[PDB]
């Protein structure tokens, strides 16, 4: 790229509990877990920045991380697939 902010992410399937969606616009400030790896309920797995505001998207249940569609400093828009978990 020169800058992977160009990349298009698929949309989270909304009626599917494995897909975490972007609840709002913003930026990936820190990638935190990798593809295929164990996490507990309420674990930080991705720090976003909204409008000079932190918020740390956390895991809904105990999981094996299926996919991660993001790197540090990627653009994100409402309804974007950020993570999958089993």
């Amino acid at each position: 790229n020169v800058h992977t902010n160009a990349n298009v992410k698929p949309k989270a399937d909304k009626s599917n509990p494995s897909h975490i969606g972007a609840q709002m616009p913003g930026s990936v400030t820190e990638v935190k877990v990798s593809v295929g790896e164990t996490v507990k309920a309420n674990q930080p797995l991705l720090i976003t920045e909204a409008m000079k505001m932190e918020t740390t998207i956390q895991a809904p249940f105990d999981g094996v991380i299926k996919q991660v569609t993001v790197n540090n400093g990627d653009t994100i828009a409402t309804g974007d697939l950020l993570i999958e978990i089993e």
Binding site: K14, S15, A77, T78, G79
Partner: protein
Amino acid sequence: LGYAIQCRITTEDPLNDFMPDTGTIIAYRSSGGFGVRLDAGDGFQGAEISPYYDSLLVKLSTHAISFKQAEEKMVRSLREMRIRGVKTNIPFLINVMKNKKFTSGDYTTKFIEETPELFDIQPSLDRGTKTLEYIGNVTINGFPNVEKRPKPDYELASIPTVSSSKIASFSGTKQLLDEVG
């Protein structure tokens, strides 16, 4: 073994004295199926069918132990070809196929002139393509007094539902009126 029919599909506008029309083929679905050989000529998506050649689009052939079954296959292979951006003899051939006189197999060369109801053709239907166009136009140039933007995200709407039957058991003010004016 059994019987085989062949039809040739042509660019020929059967309503315009059978004149070989030309242009770009912007879509093309063949059928397939047992007892059906497709022999593709000019017929396929992308072709520039040309004022200067024989207008055969497809040669269609079918085969079954009975004439009637061979006819049933021809009718259906025809019914299932869609070609757009040019008028065709397909509606006609179908009509040839359903004709009592063709099937009985007692027919002569005068058959076509002696049967006016083979040009009993209706201008074709296309709901599916027409929709792709609308979406095509709105995606690119957008809708009248709506802010031309990405299709905004929407919350997943969960739509409550009641069965027709329960509905039909109900007796409301409508039944009231039918009853007593």
